[model samples]
Target: EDFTDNAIKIINNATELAKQQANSQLLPLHFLAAFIPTQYLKTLVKRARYEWGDFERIVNRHLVKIPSQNPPPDEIRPSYQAGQVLTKANKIKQQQKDSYVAQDHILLALLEDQSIKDIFKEAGMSVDTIKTQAIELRGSQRIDSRQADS
Candidate 1:
């Protein structure tokens, strides 16, 4: 819900695409479809915005190939993969909390990634923005107060 309108549209579109694929469950790869941007937004991403390319490349790096450096220098610090994040998110839900991991949760998890930190630096997104934004969202909120389980 905290997603900006454009991001939401992409997420919904990704969902539709996954539906077309007859997938039973949505995954981070599904979300990457949205991030690709198909309309005027696509041009915007390709022309000027760096985050779009950054995210695309990251997803490609993570999902398509198990690169020798797939985890990269930064991502290897902790077990910060989609599977790990999903596990952490589910554990949080099992405590009788609402489920659904938000983008902020991804951002929080990405903090452990040195490469992602470089990307954040390049994108002009401070760690503060990620932390604050996630805290404002439903699932990611209160993460700071709770010690990370892993």
Candidate 2:
């Protein structure tokens, strides 16, 4: 989903920031800096009443003590690519003059990502709900397309 792309970006930025701050170690504060900027995902986090401050404090405390590593996961590099997807999605919405890509855009993209879906599930989010919402939104669009013969 578009929103998950933002989360991936946030995590990637924070990972970079952590590398910069401690070179070999990552702290939780680094993670928060990346997270706060996500527009759609932030909306969902707030709706769920997840406390950034509290989580940051707890996670950072543990992160601050971690030993540094010279070479980290190269997988982190792909985060920027993931971010580009959201940026492209945003541009599409703007060109269409839509305020947000909404549930469908996010759900469809995320369904293609097994790791991202796992993360969402671990966070107590139901991919099923996302599917249901996307279906409703698609029908609401009232496009001329159909799934079967008339």
Candidate 3:
């Protein structure tokens, strides 16, 4: 399965952001940071009953501080946790019977990480609760054509 264009863009943006942060390996924190501002994710955050600004702040808080680079590294690799997030997203996509992994899948997968779980804990939101909310939000939106489209 392939990622939706938006999902691809989000990953690319996260990688760049990771590089800018001087991290050679892209982490889940970078993904969360990049995802916070998406229009689609904004809707999902609302549907999940999360305060958008507060969620963004929480995500930003976890990112490691690094000096801005004039040009990012030639290659930005995914950390083990970051790769696991994508793997989980793919698994979730299959479970949902979706052809392509969308941005929501990434969000769902990110929730599986301990670091992200901590963010939820700080906000008094349980992981199980958010998973239920995400399932509901992803309802009936699963694509079947197996084509790569946003």
Candidate 4:
């Protein structure tokens, strides 16, 4: 459950931003939602454009709806957008099998722009491999999204 220091900054700030905004802790914090889109989608979406920006807006649209309410402080399980990526990670292979650096498929939670790819590599995980692996979850999105079946 431990995270890289640089990574922590992104995640921690997201929660704070959510708290400061409408003041509810949405499962999709800006950090995880915004920062995750930063690099992993880089080379992957190099051939594409709109899809990349679309997803970020999807997260942003989902992010601001939380009502401002301060309930008792506790890190319960994730929900909604956050929860989608949570168990989705289970389908992944070699996840966190090396160091705690990758630290589970919260790789949704784990992504932190520059430092995330950094953590994955040093943890003996591949930044490129991990991104490509997630791409598989999208119904062969990299393959022109055509489903490629005759």
Estimated TM-score per prediction?
A: 0.35, 0.35, 0.82, 0.45
Return the top candidate by TM-score.
3
Tens digit of per-residue lDDT, candidate 3, span 1-150: 687877888888998788668766788888878876567666666777777786776667667553444566678888799999999989988988788887778988998899888987776666776677767764676555433323
Q: Where does the lowest 10-residue lDDT sum fall in candidate 4?
A: 141-150
37 Cα displacement, candidate 1 (Å): 4.1
Tens digits of per-residue lDDT for model 1 on 1-150? 132334345547656645555444455555444445434323333344235565456554543443233222421221334345445434534442433433334434445445545645665545455544444434444322222211
Going through the candidates in the order shown, the clash numbers are 1, 4, 0, 2
Q: Candidates' lDDT values, in order?
A: 0.44, 0.45, 0.76, 0.44
> RMSDs, each prediction?
11.3, 10.2, 3.0, 12.9
**How high is the lDDT of residue 6 in model 1?**
41
Across residues 1-150, which tens digit of lDDT does each residue of candidate 2 receive? 233334446556767766664444333334434544444434444445564454334444544555555675443333443454455545544553444453334334543455445544555566565445444433534222221101
Q: Which ten residues in a row have the lowest lDDT in candidate 2?
A: 141-150
lDDT, candidate 2, at 69:
57
> Which structure among the candidates has the greatest lDDT?
3
Candidate 4, TM-score vs. the true structure?
0.45
